[PDB]
Amino acid sequence: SSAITALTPNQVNDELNKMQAFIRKEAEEKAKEIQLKADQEYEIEKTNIVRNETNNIDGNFKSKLKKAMLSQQITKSTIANKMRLKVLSAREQSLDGIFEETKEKLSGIANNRDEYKPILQSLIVEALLKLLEPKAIVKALERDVDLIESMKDDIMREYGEKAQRAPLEEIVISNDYLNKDLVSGGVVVSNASDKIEINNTLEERLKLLSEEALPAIRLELYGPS
Amino acid sequence: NLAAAERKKTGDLSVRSLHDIVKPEDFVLNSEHLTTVLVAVPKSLKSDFEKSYETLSKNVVPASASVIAEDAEYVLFNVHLFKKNVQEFTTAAREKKFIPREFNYS
Amino acid sequence: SQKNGIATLLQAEKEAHEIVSKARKYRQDKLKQAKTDAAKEIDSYKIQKDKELKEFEQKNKAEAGVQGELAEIKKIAEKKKDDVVKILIETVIKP
């Protein structure tokens, strides 16, 4: 019969179908495992690739972020210092306004001959008492020379009493006039040899006073810091 | 000259070499699952082989047996089956007094 | 006959190999997808970090808690101001 078997033609068909089903199923399982492992490897490798770069990103991100909070802190510090600086500057300007207004008042008295005349006379004599020479050179403003030349007798008479051990011969009104923007009032008295000079102007007295009165005022309104 | 007078160059089918008996058509070449085993069966057990070889092991190809050779004492069959069941098949065949001929082709 | 079954099983093996081939194609595609998706995630992450730092810098009355002291300084000053000026004037003009 050219067909060696113990099964019916349908049984051998069932068996063949069974075997090819085995093969097909094996292939399907193999494929399933392939794809599963492929998914797992996908996840692992993606994670690794990302991590390898984030390790470098976070590295410089940390450095940049560290230098930002520092910048904020420095900003806060600079502001905090700026405010204190504004306080100290406020104190200084406060002490400035007083001497400025004082200078203004001196400039006011300077342009008031009714009160300026006895004051001007009082300053000229004091300078003479500190000079103590028979002759003296007086250097004043161009506007004051008229007032001074009208009261020379008064000056010489006043000086000849407070210093009887040192008479006064001649008072010389200099041709060199004081500066308009430097001197508001007063005189500058020099000697014949022009070695000793006595600046008895309002500005000079105010400055010399400010050299010693300013810290006194400062340490009276407030306290030493 | 077709009528050739031959002589006994070998022994019986159970122990003789098979290089001058078999041919490429008898074997299943290039298969991940399938392979071919040769079985020498004593003549008194021919019918016994024919009705039991399909269950000697699992994954034996049904109705795949064919008489390859025959002498005075033996009949040489070939059977196709899955490679992973060759061991079980040969063991079972040896248990039933059959002589599995080892033949590794390529 | 053997071929009527052998050819069947061989055909089955062929279809099987096709299946496995499809699976392997899937594998290659996933292997490349790993790198592509990695690229996208890296870029999106970098953008996110840059956005984080930028938002940290763009968001993160300083002279209000000092004016109360400045007004106090001006008060203390102006209180004894005229007196001080008066003393200063009468010190310069009076030898």
Curated annotation (Swiss-Prot), chain A:
<feature type="region of interest" description="Interaction with VMA10">
    <location>
        <begin position="18"/>
        <end position="37"/>
    </location>
</feature>
<comment type="function">
    <text>Subunit of the V1 complex of vacuolar(H+)-ATPase (V-ATPase), a multisubunit enzyme composed of a peripheral complex (V1) that hydrolyzes ATP and a membrane integral complex (V0) that translocates protons. V-ATPase is responsible for acidifying and maintaining the pH of intracellular compartments.</text>
</comment>
<dbReference type="GO" id="GO:0000139">
    <property type="term" value="C:Golgi membrane"/>
</dbReference>
<keyword id="KW-0813">Transport</keyword>
<keyword id="KW-0375">Hydrogen ion transport</keyword>
<dbReference type="GO" id="GO:0046961">
    <property type="term" value="F:proton-transporting ATPase activity, rotational mechanism"/>
</dbReference>
<dbReference type="Pfam" id="PF01991">
    <property type="entry name" value="vATP-synt_E"/>
</dbReference>
<keyword id="KW-0406">Ion transport</keyword>
<comment type="similarity">
    <text>Belongs to the V-ATPase E subunit family.</text>
</comment>
<dbReference type="GO" id="GO:0061795">
    <property type="term" value="P:Golgi lumen acidification"/>
</dbReference>
<dbReference type="GO" id="GO:0048388">
    <property type="term" value="P:endosomal lumen acidification"/>
</dbReference>
<keyword id="KW-0472">Membrane</keyword>
<keyword id="KW-0175">Coiled coil</keyword>
<dbReference type="GO" id="GO:0045121">
    <property type="term" value="C:membrane raft"/>
</dbReference>
<keyword id="KW-0926">Vacuole</keyword>
From Swiss-Prot, chain B:
<comment type="similarity">
    <text>Belongs to the V-ATPase C subunit family.</text>
</comment>
<comment type="subunit">
    <text>V-ATPase is a heteromultimeric enzyme composed of a peripheral catalytic V1 complex (components A to H) attached to an integral membrane V0 proton pore complex (components: a, c, c', c'', d, e, f and VOA1). Interacts directly with VMA4.</text>
</comment>
<comment type="function">
    <text>Subunit of the V1 complex of vacuolar(H+)-ATPase (V-ATPase), a multisubunit enzyme composed of a peripheral complex (V1) that hydrolyzes ATP and a membrane integral complex (V0) that translocates protons. V-ATPase is responsible for acidifying and maintaining the pH of intracellular compartments. Subunit C is necessary for the assembly of the catalytic sector of the enzyme and is likely to have a specific function in its catalytic activity. Reversibly leaves the enzyme after glucose depletion, causing the catalytic subcomplex V1 to detach from the V0 section.</text>
</comment>
<protein>
    <recommendedName>
        <fullName>V-type proton ATPase subunit C</fullName>
    </recommendedName>
</protein>
Swiss-Prot record, chain C:
<dbReference type="GO" id="GO:0000139">
    <property type="term" value="C:Golgi membrane"/>
</dbReference>
<dbReference type="GO" id="GO:0000329">
    <property type="term" value="C:fungal-type vacuole membrane"/>
</dbReference>
<keyword id="KW-0007">Acetylation</keyword>
<dbReference type="GO" id="GO:0046961">
    <property type="term" value="F:proton-transporting ATPase activity, rotational mechanism"/>
</dbReference>
<dbReference type="GO" id="GO:0000221">
    <property type="term" value="C:vacuolar proton-transporting V-type ATPase, V1 domain"/>
</dbReference>
<dbReference type="GO" id="GO:0016887">
    <property type="term" value="F:ATP hydrolysis activity"/>
</dbReference>
<dbReference type="GO" id="GO:0016471">
    <property type="term" value="C:vacuolar proton-transporting V-type ATPase complex"/>
</dbReference>
<dbReference type="GO" id="GO:0033176">
    <property type="term" value="C:proton-transporting V-type ATPase complex"/>
</dbReference>
<keyword id="KW-0406">Ion transport</keyword>
<dbReference type="GO" id="GO:1902600">
    <property type="term" value="P:proton transmembrane transport"/>
</dbReference>
<dbReference type="InterPro" id="IPR005124">
    <property type="entry name" value="V-ATPase_G"/>
</dbReference>
<dbReference type="GO" id="GO:0007035">
    <property type="term" value="P:vacuolar acidification"/>
</dbReference>
<dbReference type="GO" id="GO:0061795">
    <property type="term" value="P:Golgi lumen acidification"/>
</dbReference>
<keyword id="KW-0813">Transport</keyword>
<keyword id="KW-0375">Hydrogen ion transport</keyword>
